[PDB]
Amino acid sequence: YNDGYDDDNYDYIVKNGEKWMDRYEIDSLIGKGSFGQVVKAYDRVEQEWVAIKIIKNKKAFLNQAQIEVRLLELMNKHDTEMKYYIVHLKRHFMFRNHLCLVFEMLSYNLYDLLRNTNFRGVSLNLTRKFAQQMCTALLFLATPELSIIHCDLKPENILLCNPKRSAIKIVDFGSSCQLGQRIYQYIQSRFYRSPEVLLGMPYDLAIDMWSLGCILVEMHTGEPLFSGANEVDQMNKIVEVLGIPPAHILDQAPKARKFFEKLPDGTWNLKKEYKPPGTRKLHNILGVETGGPGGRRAGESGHTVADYLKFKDLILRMLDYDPKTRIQPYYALQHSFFK
Numbered sequence: 359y360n361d362g363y364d365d366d367n368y369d370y371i372v373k374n375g376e377k378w379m380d381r382y383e384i385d386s387l388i389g390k391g392s393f394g395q396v397v398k399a400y401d402r403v404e405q406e407w408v409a410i411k412i413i414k415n416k417k418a419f420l421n422q423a424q425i426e427v428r429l430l431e432l433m434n435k436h437d438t439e440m441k442y443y444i445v446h447l448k449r450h451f452m453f454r455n456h457l458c459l460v461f462e463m464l465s466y467n468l469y470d471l472l473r474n475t476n477f478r479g480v481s482l483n484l485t486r487k488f489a490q491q492m493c494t495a496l497l498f499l500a501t502p503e504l505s506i507i508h509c510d511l512k513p514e515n516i517l518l519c520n521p522k523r524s525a526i527k528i529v530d531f532g533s534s535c536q537l538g539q540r541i542y543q544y545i546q547s548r549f550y551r552s553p554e555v556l557l558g559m560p561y562d563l564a565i566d567m568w569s570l571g572c573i574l575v576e577m578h579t580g581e582p583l584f585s586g587a588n589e590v591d592q593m594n595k596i597v598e599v600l601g602i603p604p605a606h607i608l609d610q611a612p613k614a615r616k617f618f619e620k621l622p623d624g625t626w627n628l629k630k631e632y633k634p635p636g637t638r639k640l641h642n643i644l645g646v647e648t649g650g651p652g653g654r655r656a657g658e659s660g661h662t663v664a665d666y667l668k669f670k671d672l673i674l675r676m677l678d679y680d681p682k683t684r685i686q687p688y689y690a691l692q693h694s695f696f697k
């Protein structure tokens with residue numbers, strides 16, 4: 359495999375201490391994903407640490423990463439001071455037949471953060487700082503000349519800049535696309551998949567906002583909001599909480615009959631054991647009146663009934679079935695949850 363350097367999976371086999379192009383000293387493996395690996399390395403030229411994303415030596419992942427490159431460079435045109443919470447790509451090169459993207463060094467992802475809470479959540483206060491940043495970032499993505507849909511937002515793809523501050527950035531634009539290129543279908547990570555994509559419908563940048571809604575709940579409860587084991591399980595879990603989608607959407611939806619049928623009165627309903635539509639209330643998931651998630655924030659400052667109600671209202675606005683009315687970054691930042 360690649361002269362001895364690659365494993366079965368088409369990944370580069372790392373050796374600590376290795377020096378690349380008399381420039382980068384590879385310190386260690388940070389983590390793996392589908393696209394391959396990220397290693398910690400020292401750049402002797404710029405005299406800083408970098409995270410190097412090493413793409414699998416395979417056409418599918420390579421082509422995907424070149425898309426990521428194009429988009430990242432595009433974003434870096436607009437954001438010259440790194441203000442808009444998108445990881446910075448410094449440069450890229452080929453090396454032992456693997457594309458390598460060189461990023462600024464960040465810290466843990468919000469999933470790993472959640473795992474150190476034992477999946478019991480972080481504070482609403484911290485949830486709010488994540489929210490504010492994330493909404494700002496979605497606002498940047500929606501600048502006309504970018505019009506970028508991340509398409510794979512989840513806690514895994516959101517990293518702290520460092521372990522002590524609440525600053526974050528979004529990573530991983532490998533599944534990303536600009537508005538209008540609608541050739542992809544069955545996109546997003548299932549748990550965070552928007553109704554429009556589930557239903558096979560045209561989609562736009564609002565699908566990220568759906569993802570974000572899911573994420574912010576999960577950041578406070580510690581738990582995925584809508585943990586489907588497949589698309590049917592997923593649409594059903596959404597319907598538990600938010601009820602049957604509006605009829606004017608299902609009428610237009612190619613995949614409507616993957617989850618719904620019509621009753622004799624001509625109205626849409628499910629096919630198939632779950633709680634009845636809209637009875638799994640976000641009011642109880644968040645524990646607005648009941649001390650927060652699992653009652654664990656009873657008495658704790660910043661977790662009042664009032665505060666939970668603001669938060670609930672923001673979320674329901676992000677989880678609007680209708681992509682037209684779903685809250686948009688700008689007005690999400692104007693929400694009373696952030697006053």
Ligand SMILES: CN1CCN(c2ccc(-c3ncnc4ccc(-c5ccnc(N)c5)cc34)cc2F)CC1
Nearest residue numbers: 388389390396409461462463464465467529530531
């Ligand atoms: C299960 N594993 C756990 C750890 N994983 C992981 C965590 C953090 C990073 C990472 N750390 C620091 N700086 C980074 C800079 C950029 C990127 C990155 C990742 C993917 N796409 C882009 N565009 C940027 C990651 C880090 C890396 C990790 F692999 C993975 C999951």
